């Protein structure tokens, strides 16, 4: 994880957005930038000091300062909605390459919208099968990017978590789901578990108890 | 005119071996550097390795995550790059892409040969690492409750656990109920098995009266499960 990017950003049409990767190796190297849409190959947008491949619209420009490499879209358009990845050396003297974690860019078509969250506890039936799954369902949010944190009592839980990528529902708004797998003893031994959804820096937390 | 096409993706068990191919056209393959990149489900791009040209002796470098397990090679007479995946792990699941690779340099600005960049990419091939064979789902109710309800609307659903392979389809009331239904994409778990959920938002006033049944179809296992979902 030597190149770090925010997982999500949004931009309004015609506005300027900068997506930034941070890494120690970027003090010494330029970074290249890639656009990735679902179902499509990544495309190289910019590399080096100032190189933009033919075919790439000139509103994409790459810059660098300190340990940050930046892709600026001056005047975002709807077709710019995409995941954006940077890539560079992991370190000086390395023959290896690395990518940043990716930034999902939403090009707003709408005012942003907060999520609705419903947390279901394990069913008694699943506990009877010696299993326990908490199901955290998240709906109606825009942009379609959320961060999910689970807690046992007040302590963060990272093991046993699976979370789907947001996808549009039949009503054109986004939904996601997250799952926390526990043993029945883990479920019954705590006072509560919680599913906390962060969206646009605001949070909704649902709690259940055995 | 540059074309890259990956092939060979499929299912392989942990510890197994799989060979991927990438066929190239429209450029001088012989002297081109070629890179493999992968993307796990819902994750970012990860650099797997790169093979250089004859000037560098067909030298190969690997990400630490795959070193010692994957081997990259090429057959220029066929314009083909290969990825030999050995001792596969669940974490190798994902789309694998090949990319024509350049190394950035600029004599004018005194920038020495430096980072690599990926000028043209194929569409990728999917590798699924799972020890699983056909396995029907277990279906549990997500029962409506005061906790699942906000005034006049209640959420309820069905949790469809630990099946293989994809796909599972879910209907409600044999297809009579579509408004407010969302069936989520499956998660491939570390176990090599899939799980998904289907939720329906319905009128809270209806919970006493109306029957809600999720119909789970897993045709790979020849399984159908109907689960009537009621308040707890």
Residue numbers in the entry:
A (entry chain L): 2 to 9, 11 to 95, 95A, 95B, 95C, 96 to 209
B (entry chain H): 1 to 52, 52A, 52B, 52C, 53 to 82, 82A, 82B, 82C, ...
Paper's wording?
As a result, its CDR H3 showed an “open” conformation deviated from that of 10E8v4 with an RMSD of 3.1 Å, SEC behavior close to the wild-type, though with reduced affinity and potency. Crystal structures of P100fA, P100gA, P100fgAA and H31LCF variants all showed “open” CDR H3 conformations, which correlated with reduced affinity to gp41, reduced neutralizing potency against select viruses, and reduced affinity to the column matrix. Furthermore, the crystal structures of di-proline variants, 100fA, 100gA and 100fgAA, and light chain variant, His31Phe, revealed how the YPP motif and the hydrogen bonds between the CDR H3 and the CDR L1 contributed to make the alternative conformation of the CDR H3 incompatible with gp41 recognition, providing the structural basis for the reduced binding affinity to the gp41 MPER peptide and the reduced potency against select viruses.
Here we show cis-trans conformational isomerization of the Tyr-Pro-Pro (YPP) motif in the heavy chain 3rd complementarity-determining region (CDR H3) of antibody 10E8 to be the mechanistic basis of its multipeak behavior.
